[PDB]
């Protein structure tokens, strides 16, 4: 026994074991030999040579926050925007010099197997990627992290661009498997959907339920340098297999094979209104993970700790819920079930601990997007749930009835039940009812949930509402995709920076340093060399490596206005056409973009975005002044690299219309400088920046209201503005589309009547800005050192800070950057 | 209207070729809506409530249709 140990099993940076340990898994685990080895399966001896050093600190980290019973947090989001996890887990174990050497060695190209590893398809946006770096900082300040959620075989769509048509082919990521996860079979846990509520004696029973087994996985995420690695739970369903003779449902009826695919497909997939599947993916992931989290409760040496109950007094001294958005809110009335039907303390106690455990992240502005759930849905499929939330409900207004008494209105207004034809329960109100702190994302994001969105929450408990804005995390978004800046940026200050980044402010001494300034264009311009030869590489077309690199990758809606870029493309394009000679600073215009299947503008925009390209760089005037690009099935690979090569950042969603914007702040932190509206996360960049130093343009928020309050008539515009007037005229004969006219049709009369963003409005002031963009490039090293004044104070936008801020602001734990002693 | 005369009909608004010019130039309905004093009343109460006293908020999409679409 006490001789089974971790201790002998690793001599890290040395090269002559990591060669070791590749052959032991090449062979060993993956029962290949290199006279049929493929670049896969060299792939993954890597993968798991690197990971033997992972798990042993997972290991040691694990343990640690066993003996230490550190207040441990769980981060449910049901979706993980992970990516590529090699490089990521070599540079943070400090083990990326030693492999690459070893695999030189062993004369494999590290580069060539980095590329193989698939894109991991948990996540699709914003609201996933930000739980991958709040995983990252979670570790970094060693905090007893848990991050939770379902695992989607299918991740979601891997997109195509066949004739300049989007299509969605599927992501089977899993299809050779994943060496970074454990399988726990052992864990499997039982999910109930439907039932009845036999309301017996003590209680209520929630009988004749259908089971769901969730089964889990496990996958470390490591730290900086600190030698803590934190775990990433995520759920995968099966159904009981029983289904052939064994329950006798069945023999005479196997019509519920039915049962077995609709329980499978909740972990298949990702989501991509009122479906069952989602409440069924959503309620599937809650409740395995509060069964983990109670089961780790009373098992963490506090199963010796009872005092009374293994109270769940002490509950919230030891448990940190975290909802992110209104996915996981079933948290709160499931962690009363079990508290109160299961366990059996009574409901105000047990209410206690849900608000004191419970805390919630709002990521949407426009009370359109909210999460809301028809009751005959909740009854049909979780009727003992319904129950709880209409007690919920009731008691939460008395509350307000101690309040603000004799209102009759907000009773109505602040409900949990919500009127009309179709009663629902709306989630959000759920959500701040039973968490103990609401919080936005971005300054101006929680404010106006404060004072619009949830207001008459906000007077009930205004303490509640909290903001904690947003970050990217250094490692990924800074020393992985740019090492070139990393490096320059260590001479000067040292490393400290990468697990403290608000000194990269020490970089603005060296402003005017002209060995600074020098050293800064030249990454800029490796960076853009290699992001111009991968254009050529994988995926064409002709890049000019030293054009003024404007990329756009945001999500194609109406509201991110890649329509208001594509008039400043026509813009530039037509001018380059009417004064053939004047000198213009080229460009290479880049967009990117995943459509979202079924909404038809953005696959009627990505169809402009590749024509207006069809016409330009093909046409002979415009040489290679102009080109306009669309980078293809943007994922985080590319991101960590585009983003290190882009010279302009494209953020201008109207104002009024961001909550935040995470791609913002990895733009700033890589030396690109910003045109975008005063709006989202944008404001305190351009607040901390300085706004001179930002291309800050268009309409503000109160502009808009004001435009909205008289009438927005976009016609007006068309006929004070001669070269608006004329691009809408050349998408409509079809000038970009000769063998189909009329396909632009419904673009144009979008914007021309019905633009719900205004375009039109901010299209003047727009290439205003633009052409600003283009004098100062045309002026190196006054460009290159807004630049470093940009970099330099990029310091409130590491994750790490957010984290920080939530850490001691909301869950009550404290930071800590200590290298565990390990390995 | 043809057979029986005009004079024998209540027809009425906006013929088609001026509903063509108010769209070539924009209609901009907030215009009407702060000329005529006597909509701004029927919007009002749309909004306010007066026909909805439970949900007052229910004709909210009717309301900004008109408003805005
Ligand atoms: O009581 C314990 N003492 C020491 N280490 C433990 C104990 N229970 C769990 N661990 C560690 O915790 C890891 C995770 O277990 P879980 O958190 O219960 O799912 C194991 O792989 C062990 O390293
Ligand atoms: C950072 C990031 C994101 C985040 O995109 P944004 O927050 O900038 O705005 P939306 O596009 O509107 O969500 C999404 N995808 C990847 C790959 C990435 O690195």
Redesign the interface.
């Given at each position: 026994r006490k001789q089974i140990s971790v201790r002998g099993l690793a001599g890290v940076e040395n090269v002559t074991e990591l060669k070791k340990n590749f052959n032991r898994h090449l062979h060993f685990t993956l029962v290949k030999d290199r006279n049929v080895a493929t670049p896969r399966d060299y792939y993954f001896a890597l993968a798991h040579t690197v990971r033997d050093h992972l798990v042993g600190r997972w290991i040691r980290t694990q343990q640690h926050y066993y003996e230490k019973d550190p207040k441990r947090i769980y981060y449910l989001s049901l979706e993980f925007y992970m990516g590529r996890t090699l490089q990521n887990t070599m540079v943070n174990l400090a083990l990326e010099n030693a492999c690459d050497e070893a695999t030189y060695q062993l004369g494999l190209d590290m580069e060539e197997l980095e590329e193989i590893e698939e894109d991991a398809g948990l996540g699709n946006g914003g609201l996933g990627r930000l739980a991958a770096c709040f995983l990252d900082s979670m570790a970094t300040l060693g905090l007893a992290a848990y991050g939770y959620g379902i695992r989607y075989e299918f991740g979601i769509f891997n997109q195509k661009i066949c004739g300049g048509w989007q299509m969605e082919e599927a992501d089977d990521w899993l299809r050779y498997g994943n060496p970074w996860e454990k399988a726990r079979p052992e864990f499997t846990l039982p999910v109930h959907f439907y039932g009845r509520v036999e309301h017996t004696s003590q209680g209520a029973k929630w009988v004749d339920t259908q089971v769901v087994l969730a089964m889990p996985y496990d996958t470390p995420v490591p730290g900086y340098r600190n030698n803590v690695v934190n775990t990433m739970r995520l759920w995968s369903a099966k159904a009981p297999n029983d289904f052939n003779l064994k329950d006798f449902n069945v023999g005479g009826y196997i019509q519920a094979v039915l049962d077995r695919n609709l329980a499978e497909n909740i972990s298949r997939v990702l989501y991509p209104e009122g479906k069952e599947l989602r409440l069924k993916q959503e309620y599937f992931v809650v409740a395995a993970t509060l069964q983990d989290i109670i089961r780790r409760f009373k098992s963490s040496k506090f199963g010796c700790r009872d005092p009374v109950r293994t109270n769940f007094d002490a509950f919230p001294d030891k448990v940190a819920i975290q909802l992110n958005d209104t996915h996981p809110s079933l948290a709160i009335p499931e962690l009363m079930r079990v508290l109160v039907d299961l366990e059996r303390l009574d409901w105000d106690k047990a209410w206690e601990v849900t608000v004191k455990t419970c805390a919630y992240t709002n990521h949407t502005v426009i009370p359109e997007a909210l999460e809301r759930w028809p009751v005959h849905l909740l009854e049909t499929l979780l009727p003992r749930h319904l129950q709880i939330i209409y007690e919920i409900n009731q008691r939460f207004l008395n509350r307000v009835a101690a309040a603000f008494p004799g209102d009759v209105?907000r009773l109505?207004?602040m409900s949990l039940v919500e009127?009309?034809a179709v009663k629902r329960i709306n989630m959000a109100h759920l959500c701040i009812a039973g968490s103990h702190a609401v919080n936005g994302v971005a300054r101006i994001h929680s404010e106006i949930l404060k004072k619009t969105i949830f207001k008459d929450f906000y007077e009930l408990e205004p303490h509640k509402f909290q903001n904690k804005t947003n970050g990217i995390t250094p490692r990924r978004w800074l020393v992985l995709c740019n090492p070139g800046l990393a490096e320059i940026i260590a001479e000067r200050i040292g490393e400290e920076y990468i697990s403290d980044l608000d000194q990269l402010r020490k970089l603005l001494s060296y402003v005017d340093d002209e060995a600074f300034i020098r050293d800064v264009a030249k990454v800029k311009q490796e960076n853009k060399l290699k992001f111009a030869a991968y254009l050529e590489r994988e995926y064409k077309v002709h890049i000019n490596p030293n054009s003024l690199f404007d990329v756009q990758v945001k999500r194609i809606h109406e509201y991110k206005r890649q329509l208001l870029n594509c008039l400043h493309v026509i813009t530039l394009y037509n001018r380059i056409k009417k004064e053939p000679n004047k000198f213009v600073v080229p460009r290479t215009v880049m967009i990117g973009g995943k459509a979202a299947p079924g909404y038809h503008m953005a696959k009627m925009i990505i169809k402009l975005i590749t024509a207006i390209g069809d016409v330009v760089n093909h046409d002979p005037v415009v040489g290679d002044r102009l080109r306009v690009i669309f980078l293809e099935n943007y994922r985080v690979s590319l991101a960590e690299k585009v983003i290190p090569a882009a010279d302009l950042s494209e953020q201008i969603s109207t104002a009024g219309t961001e909550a935040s914007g995470t791609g913002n702040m990895k733009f700033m932190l890589n030396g690109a400088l910003t045109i975008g509206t005063m709006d989202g996360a944008n404001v305190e960049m351009a607040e901390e920046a300085g706004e001179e130093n930002f291309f800050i343009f268009g309409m503000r928020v109160e502009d808009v209201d004001r435009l909205?309050?008289?009438?927005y008539?976009?016609?007006?515009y068309y006929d004070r503005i001669p070269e608006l007037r004329q691009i809408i005229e050349q998408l409509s004969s079809g000038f970009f589309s000769p063998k189909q006219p009329d396909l632009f049709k419904d673009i144009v009369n979008m914007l021309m009547?019905?633009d719900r963003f205004k375009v039109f409005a901010d299209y003047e002031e727009y290439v205003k800005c633009q052409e600003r963009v283009s004098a100062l490039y045309k002026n190196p090293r006054e460009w290159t050192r807004m630049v470093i004044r940009n970099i330099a104070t990029s310091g409130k936008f590491s994750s790490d800070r957010t984290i920080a801020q939530y850490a001691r602001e909301i869950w009550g734990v404290e930071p800590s950057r200590q290298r565990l002693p390990a390995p």
């Open positions: 209105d109505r207004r009127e009309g909205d309050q008289r009438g008539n976009a016609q007006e009547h019905h």
